[PDB]
Structures are given as C-alpha cells and as structure tokens.
C-alpha cells in the first residue's frame, strides 16, 4: 500500500496473508468469507508470463495477522489448502479479466477478536454502493512505494467513473473490473501495489453497518502514478461463479 497508514488491531479481521512455504515469503493478500473459504485474485496463483503456477501444497494461509514478518503466537492461525479454484475464463493472456480464485481450507478456522469473515454483496448492496465518488478501503502488507511495512497498511479510495478508467490506460477494460484512486487534481494519493494483490476492497454499508467486499486488488501500471488507477475485480459480477463453486464443493 502506497500513502497508507498502519491499520488498527482487529480493523480488518477478514484479511488473510498468502504465504509461500519455500522460500518463506509473502505471496499475496486474500480475504476470509466463511470459516472454510478464502477469496483471492487468480494472478496470485496462476500467471504464465512470469512462470507463476502455485498448487495447494506450495502455500499456507495466515489468518488474524497484524505484523508482516512476526509469527504472532497465540493470535494468528495458520492453515493448509485443500483445494484451489481459478475462474475458468480468467484471462491472464490479455487483461486479467475475471481475476478471481477461491481456496478451500483443510479445516474450518475458529473465529476470534482478530479473525472474522467479511460479507459478500448482494445485487442491491452492489447497486447502492458501487458508485463514482463513494470510497472503499484497501488493506495489505505490500510495497510502500513503486520499502516494506512492519504492520498491515490501510488506505481509503474513491471509485472512479468508468470512462476515466478506460481513458487512463491502453489495456482493454471489461465489466468485471472497476478502478479506484484519486485524480491528479484531487491532491490526495494512495494505491495498492506489489504484494497487495488478491486483497479485499471493502465498503461499509450505511444501511446495516456491515462490511462488504466489493473488489479484489487486481492490477495497475506502477503504483500510485498520477493519472493512473488501481483496478479491482468486480466481485458481485462474479458472484454466481462463486456461489456455484461453494455449494458444489
């Protein structure tokens, strides 16, 4: 996260760290959506142009963390993966269209003060909240600039109008994406960056006071560049694929 701040303890209890077994390193963020399912970005697991192709046994999920590097004894839970599911039509070849993956944990995780699932939006929530100008929140242990934080970072960013998203890049934008960030005129900054991928873009419902995940940190060109924006996987748009995977497996 660039131009963010240290998160508060328990501020983002659905935040998951994707951790590589060997070498031991941070792979990506992710989010907890039930006691057994973790949501992340496909490019975190599979991206052939960089020879990236992780399997269940390459990874650990670490839930309930604050410190990036510390083993948070008695606080974090570490879990193994039973099964990874990548969206069938994930377009890694072109534009990271449908950049979404689900991960089933070997065993259910126990909820605590530090560990708690975020909600998935229904159609009404999405319609109501996904609007230009409305702000969401991104969290992660990623790079601080285009150098690494000791603690989970947080930043709040506005959803940007679609035409402005399109006109900022040469990449072909789809309905399965939205972009977020400040315009260069707005005089505030902030962006996700490397290491933040697969993390949650969340919004708090003013109707029922619940946090909902609207987006997944997906891609950008550099980090926090003027006139460039962060792109997020549009979660509600892919919800039928999510529901399908979950009640089928």
């Amino acid at each position: 996260i660039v131009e963010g701040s240290d998160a508060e303890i328990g501020m983002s209890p659905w935040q998951v760290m994707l951790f590589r077994k060997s070498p031991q390193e941070l792979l990506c963020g992710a989010s907890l959506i039930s006691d057994r399912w973790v949501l992340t970005a496909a490019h975190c697991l599979l991206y052939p142009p960089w020879d990236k192709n992780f399997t269940e046994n390459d990874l650990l999920v670490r839930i309930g963390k604050h410190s990036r590097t510390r083993y948070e004894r008695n606080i974090e839970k570490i879990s193994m993966l039973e099964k990874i599911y990548i969206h069938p039509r994930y377009n890694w070849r072109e534009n990271l269209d449908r950049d979404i993956a689900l991960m089933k944990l070997k065993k259910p995780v126990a909820f605590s003060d530090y560990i708690h699932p975020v909600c998935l939006p229904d159609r009404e929530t999405a319609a109501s909240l996904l609007q230009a100008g409305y702000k969401g929140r991104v969290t992660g242990w990623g790079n601080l600039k285009e150098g690494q934080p000791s603690v989970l970072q947080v930043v709040n960013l506005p959803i940007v109008e679609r035409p402005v998203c399109k006109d900022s890049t040469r990449i072909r934008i789809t309905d399965n994406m939205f972009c977020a960030g400040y315009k260069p005129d707005e005089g505030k900054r902030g962006d996700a960056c490397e290491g933040d991928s697969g993390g949650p873009f969340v919004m708090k419902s003013p109707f029922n006071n619940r946090w909902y995940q609207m987006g997944i940190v997906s891609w950008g060109e550099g980090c926090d560049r003027d006139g460039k924006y962060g792109f997020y996987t549009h979660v509600f748009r892919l919800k039928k694929w999510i529901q399908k995977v979950i009640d089928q497996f």
Partner: peptide, 11 residues
C-alpha cells in the same frame, strides 16, 4: 526477514 513459523506447517 520473516520469523520462522512452527513446523507443523512446512509440510
């Protein structure tokens, strides 16, 4: 950089 984790998990 990363503190080692208990080893239960490096399976």
């Amino acid at each position: 950089d990363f503190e080692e984790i208990p080893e239960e998990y490096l399976q």
